[PDB]
Design a protein around this nucleic acid. Sequence first.
DNA 1: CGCGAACGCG
DNA 2: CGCGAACGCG
Length: 134
Amino acid sequence: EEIIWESLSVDVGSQGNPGIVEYKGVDTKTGEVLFEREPIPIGTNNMGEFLAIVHGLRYLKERNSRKPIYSNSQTAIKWVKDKKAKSTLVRNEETALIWKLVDEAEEWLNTHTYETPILKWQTDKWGEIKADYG
DNA sequence: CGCGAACGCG
DNA sequence: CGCGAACGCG
Ligand SMILES: [Mg+2]
């Protein structure tokens, strides 16, 4: 399998797991930051990766782009394809925001179609994903 | 740590 | 028994 350079790559910046979650989507070729989510006070890395892919799908759909999305998270890719985020994170006041976003992302997936291929970034083959926070 | 995948009680 | 409940990464 070869890299598709005309694509969007996403990744999460965590401060702990669970912990603060942010994410962004970048042009795989140029590194241009296409969208970002400001720090969510608490969530899991998996939840953040799920949100990042869905944000990417919504971004690409709005722009009518056929570019694929790369994620390094096999778990998040499965959740998006299942249209179900199987997170174990407790639902309380503290986690209310991350769960609101996850629930809304699920709702989006269950009420829309999309053409974007969702591909696994292979770090062992290709190095860091372009959206890595470093 | 959180994920998916791989014992004990009825 | 046997059906659920309870390691390997990144
Ligand atoms: Mg990540």
